[PDB]
PDB file of C-alpha atoms and ligand atoms in Angstrom:
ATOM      1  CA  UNK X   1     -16.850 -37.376  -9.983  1.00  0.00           C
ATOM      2  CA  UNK X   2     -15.394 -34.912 -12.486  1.00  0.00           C
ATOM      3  CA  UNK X   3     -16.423 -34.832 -16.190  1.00  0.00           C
ATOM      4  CA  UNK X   4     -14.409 -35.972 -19.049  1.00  0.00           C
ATOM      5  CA  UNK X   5     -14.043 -32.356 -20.643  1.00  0.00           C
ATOM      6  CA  UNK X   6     -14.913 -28.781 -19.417  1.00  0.00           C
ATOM      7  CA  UNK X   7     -14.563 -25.594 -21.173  1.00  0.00           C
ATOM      8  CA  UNK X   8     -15.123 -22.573 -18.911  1.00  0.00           C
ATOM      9  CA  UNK X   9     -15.188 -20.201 -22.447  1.00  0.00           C
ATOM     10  CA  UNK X  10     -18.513 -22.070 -22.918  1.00  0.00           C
ATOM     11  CA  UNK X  11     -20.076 -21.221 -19.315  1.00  0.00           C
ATOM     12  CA  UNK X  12     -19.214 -16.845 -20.318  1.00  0.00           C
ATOM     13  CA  UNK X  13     -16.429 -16.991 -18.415  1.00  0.00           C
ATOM     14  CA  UNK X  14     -13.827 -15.862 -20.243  1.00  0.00           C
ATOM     15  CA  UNK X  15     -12.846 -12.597 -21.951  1.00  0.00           C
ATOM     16  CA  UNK X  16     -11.515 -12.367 -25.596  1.00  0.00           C
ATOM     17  CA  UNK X  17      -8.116 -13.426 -26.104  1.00  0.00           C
ATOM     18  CA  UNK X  18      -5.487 -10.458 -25.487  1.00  0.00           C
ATOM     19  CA  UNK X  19      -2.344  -9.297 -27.809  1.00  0.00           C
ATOM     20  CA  UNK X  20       0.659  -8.741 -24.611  1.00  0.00           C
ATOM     21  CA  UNK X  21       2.601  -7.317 -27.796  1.00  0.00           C
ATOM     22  CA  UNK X  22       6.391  -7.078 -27.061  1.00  0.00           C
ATOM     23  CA  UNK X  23       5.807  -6.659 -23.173  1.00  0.00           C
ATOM     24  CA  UNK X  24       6.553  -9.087 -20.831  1.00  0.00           C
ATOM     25  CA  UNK X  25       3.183  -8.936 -18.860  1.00  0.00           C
ATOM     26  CA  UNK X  26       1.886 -12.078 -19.602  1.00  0.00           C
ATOM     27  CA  UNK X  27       2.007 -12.819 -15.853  1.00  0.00           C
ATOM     28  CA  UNK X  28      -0.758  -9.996 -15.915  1.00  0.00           C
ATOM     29  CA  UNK X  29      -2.605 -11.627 -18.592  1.00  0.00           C
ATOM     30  CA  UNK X  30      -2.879 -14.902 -16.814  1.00  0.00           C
ATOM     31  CA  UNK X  31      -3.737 -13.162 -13.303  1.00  0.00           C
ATOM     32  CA  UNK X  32      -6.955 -11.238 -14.696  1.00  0.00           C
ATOM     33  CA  UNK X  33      -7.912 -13.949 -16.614  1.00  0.00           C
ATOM     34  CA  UNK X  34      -8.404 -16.013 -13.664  1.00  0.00           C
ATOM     35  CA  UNK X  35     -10.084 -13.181 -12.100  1.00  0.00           C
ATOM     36  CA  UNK X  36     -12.368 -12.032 -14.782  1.00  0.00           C
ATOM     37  CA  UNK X  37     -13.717 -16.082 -14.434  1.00  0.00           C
ATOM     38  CA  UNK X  38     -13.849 -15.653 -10.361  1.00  0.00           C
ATOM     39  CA  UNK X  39     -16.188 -12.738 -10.925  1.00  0.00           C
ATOM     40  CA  UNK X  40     -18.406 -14.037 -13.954  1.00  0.00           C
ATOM     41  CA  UNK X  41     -18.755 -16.783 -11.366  1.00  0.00           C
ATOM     42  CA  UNK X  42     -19.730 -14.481  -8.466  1.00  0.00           C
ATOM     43  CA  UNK X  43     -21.202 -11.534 -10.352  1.00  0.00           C
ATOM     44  CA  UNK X  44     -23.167 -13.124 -13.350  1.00  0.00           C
ATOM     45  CA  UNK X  45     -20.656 -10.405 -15.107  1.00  0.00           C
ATOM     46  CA  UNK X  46     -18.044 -11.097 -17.997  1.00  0.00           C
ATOM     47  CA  UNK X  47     -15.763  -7.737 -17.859  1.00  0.00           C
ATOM     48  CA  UNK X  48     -11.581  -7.778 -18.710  1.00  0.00           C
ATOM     49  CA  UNK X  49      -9.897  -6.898 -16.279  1.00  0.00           C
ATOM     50  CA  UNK X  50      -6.964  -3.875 -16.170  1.00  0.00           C
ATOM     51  CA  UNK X  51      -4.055  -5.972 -16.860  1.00  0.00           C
ATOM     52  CA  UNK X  52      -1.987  -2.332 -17.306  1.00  0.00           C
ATOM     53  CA  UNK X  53      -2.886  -1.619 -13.519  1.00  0.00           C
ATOM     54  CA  UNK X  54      -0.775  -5.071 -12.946  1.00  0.00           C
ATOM     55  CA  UNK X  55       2.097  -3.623 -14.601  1.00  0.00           C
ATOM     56  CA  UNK X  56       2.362  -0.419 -13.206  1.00  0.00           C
ATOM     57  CA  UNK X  57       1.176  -1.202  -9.803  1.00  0.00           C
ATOM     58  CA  UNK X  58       1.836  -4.882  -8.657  1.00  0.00           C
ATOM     59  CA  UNK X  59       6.065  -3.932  -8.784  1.00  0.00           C
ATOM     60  CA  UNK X  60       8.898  -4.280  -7.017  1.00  0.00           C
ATOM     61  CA  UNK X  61       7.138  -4.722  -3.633  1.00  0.00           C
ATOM     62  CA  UNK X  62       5.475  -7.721  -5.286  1.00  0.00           C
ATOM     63  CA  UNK X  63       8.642  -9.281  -6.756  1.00  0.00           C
ATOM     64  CA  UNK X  64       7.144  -8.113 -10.417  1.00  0.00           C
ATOM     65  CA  UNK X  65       9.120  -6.146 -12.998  1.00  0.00           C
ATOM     66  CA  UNK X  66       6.331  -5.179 -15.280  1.00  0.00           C
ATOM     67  CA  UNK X  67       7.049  -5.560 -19.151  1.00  0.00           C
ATOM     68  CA  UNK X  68      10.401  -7.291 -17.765  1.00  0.00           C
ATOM     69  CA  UNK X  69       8.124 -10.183 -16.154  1.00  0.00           C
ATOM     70  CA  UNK X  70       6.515 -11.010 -13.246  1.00  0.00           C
ATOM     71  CA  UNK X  71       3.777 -13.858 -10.912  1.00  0.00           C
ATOM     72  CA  UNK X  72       0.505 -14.251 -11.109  1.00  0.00           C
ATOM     73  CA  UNK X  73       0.501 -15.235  -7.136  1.00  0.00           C
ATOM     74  CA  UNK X  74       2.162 -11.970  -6.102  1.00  0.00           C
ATOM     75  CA  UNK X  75      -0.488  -9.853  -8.510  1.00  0.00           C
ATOM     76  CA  UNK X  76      -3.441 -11.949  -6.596  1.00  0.00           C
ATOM     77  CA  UNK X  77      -1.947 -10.279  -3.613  1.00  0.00           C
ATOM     78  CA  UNK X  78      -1.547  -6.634  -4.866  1.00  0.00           C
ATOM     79  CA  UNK X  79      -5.181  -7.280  -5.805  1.00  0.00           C
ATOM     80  CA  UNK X  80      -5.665  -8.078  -2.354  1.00  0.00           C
ATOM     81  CA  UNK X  81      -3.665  -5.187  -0.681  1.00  0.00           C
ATOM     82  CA  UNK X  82      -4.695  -2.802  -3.175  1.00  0.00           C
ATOM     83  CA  UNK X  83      -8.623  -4.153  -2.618  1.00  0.00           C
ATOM     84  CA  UNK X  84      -9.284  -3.759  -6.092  1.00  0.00           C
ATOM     85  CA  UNK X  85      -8.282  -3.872  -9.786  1.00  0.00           C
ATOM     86  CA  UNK X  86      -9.664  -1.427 -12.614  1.00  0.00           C
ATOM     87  CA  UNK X  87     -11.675  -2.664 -15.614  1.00  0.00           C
ATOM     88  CA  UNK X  88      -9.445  -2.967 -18.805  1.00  0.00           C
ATOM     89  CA  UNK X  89     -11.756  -0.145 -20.335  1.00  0.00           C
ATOM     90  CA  UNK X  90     -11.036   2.520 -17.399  1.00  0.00           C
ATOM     91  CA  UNK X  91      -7.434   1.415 -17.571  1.00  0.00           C
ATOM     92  CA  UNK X  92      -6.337   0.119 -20.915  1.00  0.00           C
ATOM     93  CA  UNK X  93      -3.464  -1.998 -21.812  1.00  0.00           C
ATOM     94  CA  UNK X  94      -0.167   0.117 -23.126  1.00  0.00           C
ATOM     95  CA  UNK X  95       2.556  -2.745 -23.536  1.00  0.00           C
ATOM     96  CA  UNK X  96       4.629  -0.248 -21.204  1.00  0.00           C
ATOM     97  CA  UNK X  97       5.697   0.357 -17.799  1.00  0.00           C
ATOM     98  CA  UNK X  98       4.146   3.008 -16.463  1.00  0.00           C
ATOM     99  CA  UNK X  99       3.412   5.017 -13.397  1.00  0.00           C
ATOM    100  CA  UNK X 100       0.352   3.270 -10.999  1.00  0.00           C
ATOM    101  CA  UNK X 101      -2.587   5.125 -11.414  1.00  0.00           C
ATOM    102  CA  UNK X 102      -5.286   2.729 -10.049  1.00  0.00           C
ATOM    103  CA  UNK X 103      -8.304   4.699  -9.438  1.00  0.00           C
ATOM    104  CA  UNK X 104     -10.906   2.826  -6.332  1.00  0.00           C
ATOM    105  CA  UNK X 105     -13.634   4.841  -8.408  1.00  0.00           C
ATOM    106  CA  UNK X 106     -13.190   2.299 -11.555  1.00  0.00           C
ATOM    107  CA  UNK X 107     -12.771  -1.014  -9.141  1.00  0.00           C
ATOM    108  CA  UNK X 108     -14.402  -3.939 -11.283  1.00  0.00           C
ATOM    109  CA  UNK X 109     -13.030  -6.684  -8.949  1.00  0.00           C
ATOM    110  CA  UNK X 110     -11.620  -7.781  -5.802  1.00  0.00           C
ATOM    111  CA  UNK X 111      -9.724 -10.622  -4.512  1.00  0.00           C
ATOM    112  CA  UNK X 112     -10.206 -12.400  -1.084  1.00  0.00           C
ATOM    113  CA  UNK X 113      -7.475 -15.001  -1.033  1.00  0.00           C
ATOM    114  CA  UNK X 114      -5.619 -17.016  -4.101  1.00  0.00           C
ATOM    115  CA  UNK X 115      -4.703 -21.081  -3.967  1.00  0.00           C
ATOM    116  CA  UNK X 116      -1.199 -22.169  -5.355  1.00  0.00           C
ATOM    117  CA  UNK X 117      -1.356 -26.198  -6.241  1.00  0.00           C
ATOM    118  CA  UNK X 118       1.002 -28.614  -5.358  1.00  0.00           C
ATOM    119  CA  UNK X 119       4.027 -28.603  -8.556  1.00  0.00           C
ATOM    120  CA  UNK X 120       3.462 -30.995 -10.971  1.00  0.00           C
ATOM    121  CA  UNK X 121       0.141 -32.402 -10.050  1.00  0.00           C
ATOM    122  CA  UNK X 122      -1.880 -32.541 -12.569  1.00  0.00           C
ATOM    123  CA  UNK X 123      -4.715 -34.422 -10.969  1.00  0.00           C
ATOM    124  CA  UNK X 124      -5.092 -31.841  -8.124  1.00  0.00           C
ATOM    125  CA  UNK X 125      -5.535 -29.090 -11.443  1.00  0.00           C
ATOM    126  CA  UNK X 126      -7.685 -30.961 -12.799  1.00  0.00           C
ATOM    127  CA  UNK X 127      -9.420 -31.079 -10.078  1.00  0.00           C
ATOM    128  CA  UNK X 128      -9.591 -27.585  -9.887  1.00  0.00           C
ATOM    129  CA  UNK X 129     -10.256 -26.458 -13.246  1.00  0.00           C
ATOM    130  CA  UNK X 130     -13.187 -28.797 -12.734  1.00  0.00           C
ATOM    131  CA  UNK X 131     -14.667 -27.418  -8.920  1.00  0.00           C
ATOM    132  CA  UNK X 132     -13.066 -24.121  -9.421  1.00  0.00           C
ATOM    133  CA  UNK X 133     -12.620 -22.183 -12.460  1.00  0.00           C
ATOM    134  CA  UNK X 134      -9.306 -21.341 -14.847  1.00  0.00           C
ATOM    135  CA  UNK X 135      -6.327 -21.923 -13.133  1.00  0.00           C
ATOM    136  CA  UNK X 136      -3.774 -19.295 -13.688  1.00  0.00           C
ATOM    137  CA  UNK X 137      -0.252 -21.437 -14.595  1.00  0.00           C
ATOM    138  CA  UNK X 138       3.488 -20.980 -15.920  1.00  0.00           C
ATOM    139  CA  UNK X 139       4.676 -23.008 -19.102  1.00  0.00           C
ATOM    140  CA  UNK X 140       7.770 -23.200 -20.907  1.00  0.00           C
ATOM    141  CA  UNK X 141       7.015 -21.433 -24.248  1.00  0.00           C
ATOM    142  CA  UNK X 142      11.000 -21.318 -24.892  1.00  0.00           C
ATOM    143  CA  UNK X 143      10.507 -23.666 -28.263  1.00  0.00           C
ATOM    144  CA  UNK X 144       9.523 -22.348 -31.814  1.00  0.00           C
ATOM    145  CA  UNK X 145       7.116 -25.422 -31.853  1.00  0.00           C
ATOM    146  CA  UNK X 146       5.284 -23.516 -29.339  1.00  0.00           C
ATOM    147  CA  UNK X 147       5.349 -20.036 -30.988  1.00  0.00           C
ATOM    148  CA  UNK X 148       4.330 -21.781 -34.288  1.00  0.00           C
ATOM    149  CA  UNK X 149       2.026 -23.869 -32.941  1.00  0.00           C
ATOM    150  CA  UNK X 150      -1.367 -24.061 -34.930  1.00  0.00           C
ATOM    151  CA  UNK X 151      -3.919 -26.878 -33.930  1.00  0.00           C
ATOM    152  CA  UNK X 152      -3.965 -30.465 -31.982  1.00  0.00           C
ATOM    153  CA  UNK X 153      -2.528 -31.423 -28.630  1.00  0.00           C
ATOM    154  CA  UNK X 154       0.886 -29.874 -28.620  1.00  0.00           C
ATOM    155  CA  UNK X 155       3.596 -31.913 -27.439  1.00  0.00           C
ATOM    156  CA  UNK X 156       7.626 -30.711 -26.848  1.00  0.00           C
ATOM    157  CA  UNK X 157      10.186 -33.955 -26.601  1.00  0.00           C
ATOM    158  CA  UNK X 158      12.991 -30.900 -25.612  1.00  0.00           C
ATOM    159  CA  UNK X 159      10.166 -29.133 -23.139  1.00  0.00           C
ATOM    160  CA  UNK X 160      10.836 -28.921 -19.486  1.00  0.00           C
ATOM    161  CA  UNK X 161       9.377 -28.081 -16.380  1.00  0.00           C
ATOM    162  CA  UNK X 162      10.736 -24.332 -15.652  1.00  0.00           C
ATOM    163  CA  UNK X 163       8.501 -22.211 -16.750  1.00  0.00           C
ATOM    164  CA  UNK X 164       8.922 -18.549 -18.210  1.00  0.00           C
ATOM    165  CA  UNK X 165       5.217 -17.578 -20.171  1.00  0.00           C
ATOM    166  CA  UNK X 166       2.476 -17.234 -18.027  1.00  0.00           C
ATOM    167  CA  UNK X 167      -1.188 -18.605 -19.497  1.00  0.00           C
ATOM    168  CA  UNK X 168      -4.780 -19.713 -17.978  1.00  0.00           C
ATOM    169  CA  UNK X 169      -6.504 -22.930 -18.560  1.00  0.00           C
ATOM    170  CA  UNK X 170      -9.795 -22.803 -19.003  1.00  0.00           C
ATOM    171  CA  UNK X 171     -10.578 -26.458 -19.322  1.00  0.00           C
ATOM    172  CA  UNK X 172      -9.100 -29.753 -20.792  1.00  0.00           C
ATOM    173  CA  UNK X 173     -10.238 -32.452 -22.662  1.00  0.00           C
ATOM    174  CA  UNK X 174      -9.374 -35.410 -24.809  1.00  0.00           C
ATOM    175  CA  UNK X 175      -8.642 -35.225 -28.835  1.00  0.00           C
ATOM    176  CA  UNK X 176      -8.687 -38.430 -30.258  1.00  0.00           C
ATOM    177  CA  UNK X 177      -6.958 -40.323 -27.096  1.00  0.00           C
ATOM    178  CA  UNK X 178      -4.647 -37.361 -26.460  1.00  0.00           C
ATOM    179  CA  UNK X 179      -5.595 -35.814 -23.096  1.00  0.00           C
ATOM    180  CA  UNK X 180      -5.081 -31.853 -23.247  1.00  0.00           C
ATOM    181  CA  UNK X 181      -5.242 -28.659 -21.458  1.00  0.00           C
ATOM    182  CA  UNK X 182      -7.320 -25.721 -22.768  1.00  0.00           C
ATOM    183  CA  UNK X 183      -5.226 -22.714 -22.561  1.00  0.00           C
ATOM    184  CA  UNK X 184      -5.530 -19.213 -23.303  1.00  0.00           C
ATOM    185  CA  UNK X 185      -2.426 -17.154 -24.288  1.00  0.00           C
ATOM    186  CA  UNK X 186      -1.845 -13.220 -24.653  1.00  0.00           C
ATOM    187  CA  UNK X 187      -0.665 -13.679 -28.205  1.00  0.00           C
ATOM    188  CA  UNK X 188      -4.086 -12.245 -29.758  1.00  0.00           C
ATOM    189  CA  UNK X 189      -6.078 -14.181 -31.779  1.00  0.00           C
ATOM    190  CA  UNK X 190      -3.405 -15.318 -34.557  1.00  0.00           C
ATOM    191  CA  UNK X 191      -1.611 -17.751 -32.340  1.00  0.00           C
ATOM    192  CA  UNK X 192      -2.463 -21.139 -32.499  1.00  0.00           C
ATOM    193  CA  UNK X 193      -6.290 -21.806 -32.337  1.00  0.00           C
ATOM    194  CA  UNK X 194      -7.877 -18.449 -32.455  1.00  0.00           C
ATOM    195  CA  UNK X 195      -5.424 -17.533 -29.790  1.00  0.00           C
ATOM    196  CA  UNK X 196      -5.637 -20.885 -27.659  1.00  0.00           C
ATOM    197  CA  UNK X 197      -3.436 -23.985 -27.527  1.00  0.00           C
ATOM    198  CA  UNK X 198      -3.923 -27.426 -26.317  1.00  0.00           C
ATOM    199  CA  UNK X 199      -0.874 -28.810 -24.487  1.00  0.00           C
ATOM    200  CA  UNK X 200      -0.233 -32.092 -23.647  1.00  0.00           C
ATOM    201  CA  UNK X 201      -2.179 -33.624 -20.382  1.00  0.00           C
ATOM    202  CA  UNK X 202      -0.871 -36.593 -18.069  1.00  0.00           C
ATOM    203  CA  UNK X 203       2.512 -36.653 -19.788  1.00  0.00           C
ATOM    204  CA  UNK X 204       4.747 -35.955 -16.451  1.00  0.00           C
ATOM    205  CA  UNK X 205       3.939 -32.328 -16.262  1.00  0.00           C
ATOM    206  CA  UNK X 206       4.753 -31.268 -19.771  1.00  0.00           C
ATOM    207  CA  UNK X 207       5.896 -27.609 -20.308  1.00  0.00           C
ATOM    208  CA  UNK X 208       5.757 -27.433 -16.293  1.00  0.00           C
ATOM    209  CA  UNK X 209       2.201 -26.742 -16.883  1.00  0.00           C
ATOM    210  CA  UNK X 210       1.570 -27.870 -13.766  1.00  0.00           C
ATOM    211  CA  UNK X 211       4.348 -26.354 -12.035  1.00  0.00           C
ATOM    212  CA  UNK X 212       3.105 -23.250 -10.342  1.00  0.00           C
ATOM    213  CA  UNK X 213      -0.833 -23.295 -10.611  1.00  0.00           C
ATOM    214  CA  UNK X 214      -2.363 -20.552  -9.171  1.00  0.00           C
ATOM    215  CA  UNK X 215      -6.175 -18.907  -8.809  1.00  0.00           C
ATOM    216  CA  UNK X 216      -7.860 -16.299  -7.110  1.00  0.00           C
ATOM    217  CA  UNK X 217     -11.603 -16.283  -4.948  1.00  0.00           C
ATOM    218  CA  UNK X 218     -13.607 -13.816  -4.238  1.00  0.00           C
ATOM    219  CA  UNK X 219     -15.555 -12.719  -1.524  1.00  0.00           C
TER     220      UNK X 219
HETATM  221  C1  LIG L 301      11.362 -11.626  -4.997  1.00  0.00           C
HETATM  222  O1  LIG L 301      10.199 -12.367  -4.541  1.00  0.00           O
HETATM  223  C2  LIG L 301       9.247 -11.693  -3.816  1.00  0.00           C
HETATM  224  C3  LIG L 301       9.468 -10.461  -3.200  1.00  0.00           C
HETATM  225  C4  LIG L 301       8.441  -9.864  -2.487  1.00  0.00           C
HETATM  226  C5  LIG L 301       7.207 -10.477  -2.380  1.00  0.00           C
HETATM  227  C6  LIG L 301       6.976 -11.700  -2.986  1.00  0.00           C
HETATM  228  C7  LIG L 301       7.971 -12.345  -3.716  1.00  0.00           C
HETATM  229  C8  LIG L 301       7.687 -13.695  -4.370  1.00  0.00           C
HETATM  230  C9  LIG L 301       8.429 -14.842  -3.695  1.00  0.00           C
HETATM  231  C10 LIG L 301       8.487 -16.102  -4.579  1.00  0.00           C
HETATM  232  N1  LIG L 301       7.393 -16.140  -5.585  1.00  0.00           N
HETATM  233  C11 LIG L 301       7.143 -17.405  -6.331  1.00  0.00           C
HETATM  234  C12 LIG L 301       8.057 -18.598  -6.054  1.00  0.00           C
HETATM  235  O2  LIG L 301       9.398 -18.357  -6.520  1.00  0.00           O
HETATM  236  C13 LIG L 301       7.577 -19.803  -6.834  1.00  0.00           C
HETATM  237  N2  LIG L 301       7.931 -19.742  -8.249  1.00  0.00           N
HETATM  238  N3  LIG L 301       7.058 -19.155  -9.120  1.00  0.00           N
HETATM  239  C14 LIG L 301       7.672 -19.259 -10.316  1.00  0.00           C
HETATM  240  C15 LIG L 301       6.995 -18.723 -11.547  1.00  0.00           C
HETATM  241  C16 LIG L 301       5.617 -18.823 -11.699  1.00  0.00           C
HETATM  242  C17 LIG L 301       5.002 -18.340 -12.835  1.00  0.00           C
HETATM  243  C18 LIG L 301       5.731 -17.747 -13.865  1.00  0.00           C
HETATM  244  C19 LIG L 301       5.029 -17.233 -15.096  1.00  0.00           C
HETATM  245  F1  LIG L 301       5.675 -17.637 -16.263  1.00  0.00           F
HETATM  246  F2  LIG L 301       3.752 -17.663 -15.187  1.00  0.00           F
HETATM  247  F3  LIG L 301       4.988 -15.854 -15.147  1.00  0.00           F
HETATM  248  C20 LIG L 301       7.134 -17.649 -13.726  1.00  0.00           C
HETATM  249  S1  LIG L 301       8.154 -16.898 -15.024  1.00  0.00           S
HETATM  250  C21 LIG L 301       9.540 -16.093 -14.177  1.00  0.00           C
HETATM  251  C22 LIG L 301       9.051 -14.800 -13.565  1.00  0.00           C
HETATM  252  N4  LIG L 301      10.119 -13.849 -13.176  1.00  0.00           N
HETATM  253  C23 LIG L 301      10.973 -13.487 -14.337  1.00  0.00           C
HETATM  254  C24 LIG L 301      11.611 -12.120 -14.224  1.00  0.00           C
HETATM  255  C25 LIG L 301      11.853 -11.746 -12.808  1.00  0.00           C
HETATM  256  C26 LIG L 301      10.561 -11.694 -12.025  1.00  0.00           C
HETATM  257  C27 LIG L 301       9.528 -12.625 -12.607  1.00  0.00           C
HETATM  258  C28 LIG L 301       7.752 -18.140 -12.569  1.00  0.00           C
HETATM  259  C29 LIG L 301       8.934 -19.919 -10.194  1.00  0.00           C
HETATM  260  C30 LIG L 301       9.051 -20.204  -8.874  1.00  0.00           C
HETATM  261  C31 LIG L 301      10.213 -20.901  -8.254  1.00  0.00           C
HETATM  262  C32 LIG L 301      11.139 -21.461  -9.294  1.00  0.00           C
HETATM  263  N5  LIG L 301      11.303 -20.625 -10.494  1.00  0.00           N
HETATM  264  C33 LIG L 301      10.029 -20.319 -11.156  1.00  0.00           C
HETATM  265  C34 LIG L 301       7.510 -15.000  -6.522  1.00  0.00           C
HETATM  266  C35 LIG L 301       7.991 -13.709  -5.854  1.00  0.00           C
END
């Protein structure tokens, strides 16, 4: 019923990795990165989405803090309210909090409704990375193994389920009998595999990968 591996980079539906620099806004990241798949998927059109218009306009009325953190489930719903979110090239990424200035005349996408998945099951994301597209998801980056990861399936011993980076998978697989996720990161293209890491899969929800899935539709 679902295949052994899938890659969504592979079916033009995701952007080039992004560099969050030193603001906290990877919960943006992850949100448009689900989004951007959502509307390859609907449009036929690959276009980064304003990950800036996140920060300064999914806030405090969304439980988000900007560069000081935030949820990818809350910034589905600004989305939502908002009914719309500005390409990355009309509103470019700043690593700062700043003042909203969404514009409806640069709208790229929209967002109907988002799914959050059951914590910790990793079947029912798999299931959806398969049916659905990348999942947007938290994971606890808190180890230098992580930071200095470089290639293979990453796996913490001292990794737990309480998450505090947020990333997209965009597929899983298997390397040599170690199941993985495929994930993207906002830590440009000199972390880990050209900006990608593969984190364990089936190993009792390992980084919490698992523990707050999340991903948009649209319309
Ligand atoms: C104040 O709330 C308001 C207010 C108004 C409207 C809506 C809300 C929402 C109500 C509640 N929801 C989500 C639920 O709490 C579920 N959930 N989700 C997460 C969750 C997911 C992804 C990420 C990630 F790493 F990917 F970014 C994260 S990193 C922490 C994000 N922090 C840090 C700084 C302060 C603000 C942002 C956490 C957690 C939980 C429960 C247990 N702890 C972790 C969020 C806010």
């Amino acid at each position: 019923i679902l295949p052994d591996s899938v890659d969504w980079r592979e079916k033009g539906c995701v952007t080039e990795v992004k560099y969050q620099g030193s603001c906290g806004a990877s919960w943006a990241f992850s949100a448009v990165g689900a989004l951007e798949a959502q509307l390859k998927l609907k449009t036929g059109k690959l276009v980064s989405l304003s990950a800036q218009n996140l920060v300064d306009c999914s806030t405090e009325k969304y439980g988000n803090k900007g560069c000081n953190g935030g949820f990818m489930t809350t910034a589905f719903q600004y989305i939502i309210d908002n009914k719309g979110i500005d390409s990355d090239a009309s509103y470019p990424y700043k690593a700062m909090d700043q003042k909203c200035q969404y514009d409806s005349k640069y709208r790229a996408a929209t967002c109907s409704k988002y799914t959050e998945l059951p914590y910790g099951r990793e079947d029912v994301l798999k299931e959806a990375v398969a049916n659905k597209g990348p999942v947007s998801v938290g994971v606890d980056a808190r180890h230098p193994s992580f930071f200095l990861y470089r290639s293979g399936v990453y796996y913490e011993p001292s990794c737990t389920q309480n998450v505090n980076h947020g990333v997209l998978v965009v597929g899983y697989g298997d390397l040599n009998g170690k199941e993985y996720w495929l994930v993207k990161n906002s830590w440009g293209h000199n972390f880990g595999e050209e900006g990608y890491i593969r984190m364990a899969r089936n190993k009792g929800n390992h980084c919490g990968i698992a523990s707050f899935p999340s991903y948009p539709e649209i319309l």
